[PDB]
Design a binder for this molecule. Structure first.
Ligand code: 59S
Ligand code: 59S
Lengths: 303, 303
């Protein structure tokens, strides 16, 4: 019993992290086979950051301009290319710690673990969600760029995020590992702001199911609702609409607890309209939306 | 910027986890050098759990009665001994992945990371505190025993917790790696309950400092307080007393923000007496007490 914000074990990703230095900018790289992937603004100075000309900056760089260290072992770069917002540094040694891996572009509302790194060395691991406005609420300082987000599917690490920038909201934006940004953002210091965020409704419902599984059931009421009636209330409280696909995804949790999805939706409607009146659910005074249904199943069933 | 409940990277501990099976009970073991450490109730059946005679159960076990697997590699046990509540299984191979390590007994109010495992394989990692009543609020299912808690100090893993039991509160109890329980608990199915928990005051104050560092400052008021006046209010709200040692530990955060500790204490006193009136601090509607001052410094300074 018990329910915690739980990250994937990070050892497979830890063996992939290296330090990339170009001139005076230093950030992290991801060393897979004989390629190092890292954010392309590693080739920038700060005068190259309000309107950087990346292609111009790159043509003036030769292979030796990139200092890549893995521990106290320097790796020699023997090739470089730019793909979208990411640099690919070909190195003369293949990483012996390379795990089985995939590059994935995740959808809004999905969660992943972040291994935060500085100078190529791990700092900590935590769990994030891709917000509906294509930001993430992370924890990143200067020098954390090149940190990656991932999921572990049995043996395979599915890399889905590489860190690039902070919006002055304290929220964070980045790319998939092909260098395509999540959301409308660009890798320049200009006036970009994220759209308004919304609450991930299917995730809140998964979390209420985790609550019931853990014995915190006070919020269950005697009522039911229709999907359309529920969505009309949710919308007023800035919740995303719940689709029938979402209902289907909650099937396993519904069957484990014997609570129909539309019955749990009636309980959530009452929580939205009435508040919690001082009470907590799973130790939280707010409704939580960064646990997917698969997250809940995995935690409440032992991987 | 940003602040998240962050766990230590778990790769060093992952290479140490194995599966220990004795008869029909299976749990996790910690393989360090040529010794496997695991909870001694691995030798129990359930009829041996209301009043187990561990020494009696153990004398009837021979080395071959312990099946230890590390991946799809079986390790041969060549010796066994019981130390307090933990079994030590001598094995004929030293773990090549053994990191530099220490066995530590932590104090109430300190935090650590838990690598939750089942059948010797990692499930997830999360951050816990040793509560003042010597429990932890974890996430453990059947088969998670032998999971360990740890801190990473630069290169050294300081193992401080091994998981043994769940109290029907949904809270968890265990031993240090010498097999001595934290708190008054014993490894039997009887009627044990933990003492009343209290809020870890120095940790709440560290978290308010993290809030200020991150730009969430609405709760700062114009006042100061004495240490004695503060402790009189805190006590009524089931907060532990703040000592001068605690004040000293907050020195670095106080100097970074320019807020005296006693000034931050006046702000916390007002939060305790008045509530938050709907507002959140760092996204929480409750005051958080599972970040130590070192936690906050480490996260807000990049390891
Ligand atoms: C007026 O409304 C505004 C709206 C948006 C912005 C800035 C977006 C921006 O420029 N973010 C910068 C950034 O992330 N730059 C990237 C690099 C550029 C080329 C995209 C970066 O520094 N990346 C860091 C290097 O690793 C990590 C950052 C910085 C440290 C703070 N936290 C982090 O994640 C911040 C430093 C302000 C400013 C004003
Ligand atoms: C009337 O007030 C009460 C007060 C306390 C208790 C029980 C304490 C207990 O017996 N806990 C058991 C336990 O943790 N047993 C240990 C082993 C014994 C020998 C100490 C165990 O099973 N350990 C599990 C094996 O790995 C992990 C447990 C179990 C699964 C649930 N979550 C967990 O962490 C629970 C299964 C109820 C009961 C009633």
């Amino acid at each position: 019993s018990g329910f915690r914000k739980m990250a994937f074990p990070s050892g497979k990703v830890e063996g992939c992290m290296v330090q990339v230095t170009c001139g005076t900018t230093t950030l992290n790289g991801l060393w897979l086979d004989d390629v190092v992937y890292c954010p392309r603004h590693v080739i920038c100075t700060s005068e190259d950051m309000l309107n950087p000309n990346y292609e111009d900056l790159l043509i003036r760089k030769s292979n030796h301009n990139f200092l890549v260290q893995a521990g106290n072992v320097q790796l020699r770069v023997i090739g470089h290319s730019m793909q979208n917002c990411v640099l690919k540094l070909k190195v003369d040694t293949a990483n012996p710690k390379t795990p089985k891996y995939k590059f994935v572009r995740i959808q809004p509302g999905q969660t992943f673990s972040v291994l935060a790194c500085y100078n190529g060395s791990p700092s900590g691991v935590y769990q994030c969600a891709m917000r509906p406005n294509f930001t993430i609420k992370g924890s990143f300082l200067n020098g954390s760029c090149g940190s990656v987000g991932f999921n572990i599917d049995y043996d395979c690490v599915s890399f889905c995020y590489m860190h690039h920038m902070e919006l002055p909201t304290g929220v964070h934006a980045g790319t998939d590992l092909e260098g395509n940004f999540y959301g409308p953002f660009v890798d320049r210091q200009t006036a970009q702001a994220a759209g308004t965020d919304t609450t991930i409704t299917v995730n809140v419902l998964a979390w209420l199911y985790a609550a019931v599984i853990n014995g915190d059931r006070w919020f269950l009421n005697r009522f039911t609702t229709t999907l359309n009636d529920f969505n009309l209330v949710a919308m007023k409280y800035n919740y995303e609409p719940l689709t029938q696909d979402h209902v289907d995804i909650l099937g396993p949790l519904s069957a484990q607890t014997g609570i129909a999805v539309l019955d749990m939706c009636a309980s959530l409607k009452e929580l939205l309209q009435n508040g919690m009146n001082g009470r907590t659910i799973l130790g939280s005074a707010l409704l939580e939306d960064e646990f997917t249904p698969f997250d809940v199943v995995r935690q409440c069933s032992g991987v």
